[PDB]
């Protein structure tokens, strides 16, 4: 929704609309999580929700970093040194639910 913490809301509630463009550099962890702790009138419930949100964000960042690193390492190992009736249900009793009267 709306706010400098909407991303964490989404990551804690819906998580599907959150795109690979959002996750990467939208939120500066060391600043946003720091913002969450002294924020005015924060209920414990919503705080727990936000905790799961920020942890999911961080986990996704880890996933992407691993994927890109693996891609790079696979690249670097390259070089160029030039030197009939088969299965029918038995009759119709399987699927021929009879008409009522």
């Amino acid at each position: 929704k709306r706010g400098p913490l909407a991303k964490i809301w989404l990551a804690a509630h819906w998580d599907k609309k959150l795109t690979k463009a959002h996750v990467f550099e939208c939120n500066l962890e060391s600043s946003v999580e720091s913002i969450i702790s002294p924020k005015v009138k924060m209920a414990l419930r919503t705080s727990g929700h936000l905790l799961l949100g920020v942890v999911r964000i961080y986990h996704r960042k880890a996933k992407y970093l691993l994927a890109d690193c693996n891609e790079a390492f696979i690249k670097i190992k390259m070089a160029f040194r030039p030197g009939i009736l088969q299965e029918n249900d038995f009759g119709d009793f399987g699927m021929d639910d009879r008409e009522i009267m």
């Binding site: 009879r98 008409e99 009522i100 009267m101």
Partner: protein, 438 residues
């Protein structure tokens, strides 16, 4: 179907509308064999599912179809399949909503007046009688001469035709007499004549069991038995004003008289007497409790009787009682708010509710035994009675599972189809039961 038929069809290109009427009449006249429950369900759904104003798209097409069918019936003037089918469609459209045919009843009146001796004509008379029953009380400020001629021709019809027409017309006569007019002295004199005739026959027979005048006037006696039965069923004249004096317990009278004529030597007399008792029963259920009625049924249904029309008649009595009681209960519950403020909170009646159960416990066992009969009609009627019982839960299901299983091996397909479907419904609710009786 809401897009295929019930569309407003503006007043041009009349050929399409006429073709639509042809199509719908064809559909219903072909659907006459199986049942009309599905058609009514569909039409119920289409009408209810748009309750807001919203141009009332189905209402316009419906009213234009019924009035155009009226006009088609008029312009027919003189293939009979289409006439009977059109009247049948009118009947269904009255049943689903009754206001649709308030205006055209005066145009429907002439067919009831006079007719011929052919079958399809009798079906027309029966259907128009049904329509009149459904619509006449709802008519905004009717004309008294119209009611007068209605009752007159209804009586003229009662005293001149066969069984089914007598039934389906005394129904509408009783309804119209108890809903709008009040001239019940006429019907009282009618029952006086019939009661007196049959009682004189009884008295003459009591000491002359070998006389011959009875073998001559038999038709009058038969018609009298059926008529007094139907009258006692549909239109109860054991009340304050019908007699006009101190009550002489007429219901008990007719009970004893019919019960007398049950024991006799021919067959048609017995069948008509049992029919009379059944119609009497559907009005006073408590009579089933009487010892003579008990022993009568529990002897006819058992004891390896030669007759096969008595057994069929008994089972048909039970079947019509169950159906009629169900319909009365439902349609009497639907209009609660008119009587709610005048019923107790501390009572919670049962004798008006539990009764329908109790009855079955006196006969049920015997009916089940009737599954093992060599005829087919007896088996069909027994299965109808049990499948009407169980569908309201009246009786405990797992004591009539074995018979309902052995009915799964008849030749006729509709029989075992109904049986097996009843069985799968018995199972789907209650997990264990079938494993108990296998």
């Amino acid at each position: 179907f809401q897009k295929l038929w019930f569309t407003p069809t503006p007043h041009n290109d009349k050929e399409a509308m006429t073709r639509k009427i042809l199509n719908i009449t064809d559909v219903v006249a072909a659907c006459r064999d199986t049942g009309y429950d599905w058609f009514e369900q569909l039409l119920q759904n289409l009408l209810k599912s748009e309750e807001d104003s919203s141009y009332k798209p189905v209402k316009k097409a419906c009213t234009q179809l019924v009035d155009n069918l009226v006009e088609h019936i008029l312009k027919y003037e003189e293939n009979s399949g289409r006439l009977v089918a059109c009247i049948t469609t009118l009947f269904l459209f009255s049943k689903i909503r009754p206001q649709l045919m308030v205006k055209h009843a005066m145009t429907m009146q002439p067919y009831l007046t006079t007719k011929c001796s052919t079958q399809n004509d009798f079906m027309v008379i029966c259907n128009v009688a049904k329509i009149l029953e459904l619509v006449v009380p709802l008519m905004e400020h009717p004309s008294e001469t119209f009611l007068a001629t209605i009752e007159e021709d209804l009586m003229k019809l009662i005293i001149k035709y066969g069984m089914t027409v007598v039934q389906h017309c005394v129904s509408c006569l009783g309804a119209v007499v108890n809903k709008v007019t009040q001239n019940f002295k006429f019907v009282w004199a009618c029952f006086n004549r019939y009661y007196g005739a049959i009682s004189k026959l009884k008295s003459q027979h009591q000491e002359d069991p070998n006389n011959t005048s009875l073998l001559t006037n038999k038709p009058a006696l038969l018609r009298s038995l059926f008529t007094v039965g139907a009258l006692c069923r549909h239109f109860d004249f054991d009340l304050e004003d019908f007699k006009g004096n101190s009550k002489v317990n007429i219901k008990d009278k007719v009970l004893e008289l019919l019960m007398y004529f049950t024991k006799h030597s021919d067959e048609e007399v017995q069948t008509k007497a049992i029919i009379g008792l059944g119609f009497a029963f559907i009005q006073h259920p408590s009579l089933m409790f009487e010892q003579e009625v008990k022993n009568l049924y529990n002897n006819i249904l058992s004891d390896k009787n030669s007759s096969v029309n008595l057994k069929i008649q008994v089972l048909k009595n039970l079947q019509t009682y169950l159906q009629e009681e169900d319909t009365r209960m439902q349609q009497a519950d639907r209009d609660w708010k008119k009587v709610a403020k005048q019923e107790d909170l501390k009572e919670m009646g049962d004798v008006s509710s539990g009764m329908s159960s109790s009855i079955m416990q006196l006969y049920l066992k015997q009916v089940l035994e009737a599954f093992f009969h060599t005829q087919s009609s007896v088996r069909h009627f027994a299965l109808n009675v049990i499948a009407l019982t169980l569908n309201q839960g009246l009786i405990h299901p797992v004591q009539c599972v074995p018979y309902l299983i052995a009915m799964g091996t008849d030749p006729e397909p509709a029989m075992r189809n109904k049986a097996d479907q009843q069985l799968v419904e018995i199972d789907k609710k209650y997990a264990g039961f079938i494993h108990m009786k296998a």
